[PDB]
Amino acid sequence: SSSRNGRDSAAQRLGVKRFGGQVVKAGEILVRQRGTHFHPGVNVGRGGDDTLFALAPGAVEFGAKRGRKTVNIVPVARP
Amino acid sequence: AHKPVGQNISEVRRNARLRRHARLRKKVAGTAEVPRLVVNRSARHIHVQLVNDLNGTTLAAASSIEADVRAIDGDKKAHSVRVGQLIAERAKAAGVETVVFDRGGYTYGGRIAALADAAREAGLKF
Amino acid sequence: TANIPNKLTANVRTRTGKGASRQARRDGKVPAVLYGHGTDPQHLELNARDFAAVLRSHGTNAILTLDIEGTEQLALTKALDVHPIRRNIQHADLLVVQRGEKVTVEVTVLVEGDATPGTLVTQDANTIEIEAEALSIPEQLTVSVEGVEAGTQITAGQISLPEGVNLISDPELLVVNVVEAPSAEALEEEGA
Amino acid sequence: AELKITQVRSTIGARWKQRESLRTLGLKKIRQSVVREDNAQTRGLINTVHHLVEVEEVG
């Protein structure tokens, strides 16, 4: 006999790439995801594939707004 | 023992305005540099506030409630024109030139458009 | 009806957590919490023999006078953690009560009496929820099925409560269902 | 206070974190002893290697 299974797709390496308090440059990808598990917050953009990325440099800050989990960039104080 | 059975039109209207105001707010936000000009329109009056949504603070306000506006002899659009001029003057005194107009969930036109056009005419940039 | 408090010696725990608790049980003590309307949780150990004997004599809802560092406190057994296998009491929740206080308690409904000969009595509620005074809590409520025929459905509203005792469970709860005794044919179908 | 810490067991078979905690305490051979201040950092290192060391309190 034989199995009708044996198939799978490539692992897509999704997930949080920059965690809380990490300093990021503008443009840096913060999360890779399929829907809006995380929503864009302040100075965070949403890509066409729902990637969240930084619009300005600063520290990554996770927070909740109206229950929706959100990723934010907070400006870091200049030296 | 009268018990109302459904929703009065005023209830439906109130929450539907709030709904579509929230919809507009997804994109329109105010800052100290570019405040949000919020308009509230009643049957009798029209009110405007300049809001900085970062602090949640009002920089300048104007309304048809003011005696200066109540003295106006024209129709409700004429009062809207006066309120538009008053808010531009008070905003420019507050150090503001550029604003983003928030129609408050009402159709852009009529009294709302007459206020916005009077504000533009008095030199608010929007 | 009026119950006298049963005296138990109790000492404040020096240490808390599973290590301390396991050692206490190994040395024959049961850990307990005392908490109250006064919002002042105390961590105690009771002697396992004495506490178990009180529960055997006066049931799960026994009223106790605890002796804590020489101060007597009135308390009610709120809840018991019993290990499913060893059947030992792991932990006790004790609620402080002042005399004359209303307490909501679950009491055991016993069934007494010879049902009509072709009858099987099935008890569907082990317990009913009651409001009573701290000292008036009956240790067991008895319902009599001495005569009822098949089809009868003793409900919670039909059970005698002493004075002071109020029913909090809704009256529609079936406590006893009386059914005509299954034939051998019905035993063979049931659970097939 | 001070703690005298003596290595009692081999590092053979010990995990990376255990072996490196011994290095961080300054222990490199069985029966070697180091003197360390009793602080949180020192306690955490001891907790990682408590089965490999003997701890004695000084003062």
Partner: protein, 136 residues
């Protein structure tokens, strides 16, 4: 025999025989019951055997509850087959039984006959079990 009418997943990983039962550890329907003291897969054939043993002993005038339903499939490969070529077809239905779980309950007027009946059932089960009452 007890079989589920349908299952969403007909080929399942084996149930894990770890931990003490957290649910169904007391007698809730009858006055007597059988409490498991060991881990096992109890099959529907064992349940049937045990239930009929209880019925035969009491003859009539009692009620038997089965607190456990064998909805977990175990597969089997065809005989004399090499390893590989896909997972076998479902063959047995079992309940994952943990110590503390009450498996059977009985209501009967006579305690002596009730205990004997439950003993007859215990000898049918793959595990060690004791008789437990509603009382503390």
């Amino acid at each position: 025999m007890l079989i589920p009418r349908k299952v969403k997943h007909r080929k399942q990983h084996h149930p894990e025989q770890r931990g003490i039962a957290s649910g169904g550890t007391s007698v809730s329907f009858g006055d007597y019951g059988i409490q498991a003291l060991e881990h096992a897969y109890i099959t529907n054939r064992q349940i049937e055997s045990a239930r009929i043993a209880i019925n035969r002993h009491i003859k009539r005038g009692g009620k038997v509850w089965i607190n456990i339903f064998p909805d977990r499939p175990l597969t089997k490969k065809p005989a004399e087959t090499r390893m590989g070529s896909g997972k076998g077809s479902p063959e047995w239905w079992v309940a994952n039984v943990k110590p503390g779980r009450v498996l059977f309950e009985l209501s009967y007027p006579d305690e002596k006959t009730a205990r004997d009946a439950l003993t007859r059932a215990i000898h049918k089960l793959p595990i060690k079990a004791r008789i437990v009452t509603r009382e503390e």
